Amino acid sequence: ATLKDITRRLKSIKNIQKITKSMKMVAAAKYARAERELKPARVYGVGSLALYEKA
Amino acid sequence: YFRDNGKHALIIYDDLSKQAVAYRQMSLLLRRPPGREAYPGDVFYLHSRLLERAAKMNDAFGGGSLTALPVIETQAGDVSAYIPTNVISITDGQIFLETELFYKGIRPAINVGLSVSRVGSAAQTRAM
């Protein structure tokens, strides 16, 4: 394309990359919290399933 | 001649982007200094003086008319080029044909989003 087409496309992709990096960071934080909260719920749910696999 | 004798005429230049090239060749072989993209300086004039003859005479001058439908050819849709922009700023309306619409099945490819016509309301039948 022409120079302006390339410039606009490059700016758009740079914005997209910035946004995806930020979202990766947010998702990583939420993941850490989710694992932390998943351990106790893991034991709780496994216990609740105990009966059916035992009987 | 037709529009001056009370009749109506329609003229279709096809293309004007090749008249521009022929004019550039002439001007370069007469040794006149080139301009932008090597086109002479008088490349807007070339077309403006030509498309300004498509008038709509009043009833005192016969009432005849001469419509014009110049055809331009862009390069990969670069409407921003030199001759395309000149002729776009010369003409009244536009009819943008796009290859992405041609292959998507829309034929004629007229891009109704960008196509314009200054007359609009006027010059349309009441039912339409």
Place this chain on the structure above:
Amino acid sequence: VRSSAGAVRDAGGAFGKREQAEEERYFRARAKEQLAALKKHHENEIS
């Protein structure tokens, strides 16, 4: 060469149209909801 705010919709590529539609559908939905509420309020306030 840098990047600036509101550039995704300046390019007008696929992401630009995708974003425009993602906005328009949502706000058409909310406009419909608000119009329904406006009609309800109109009727309930006649008396």
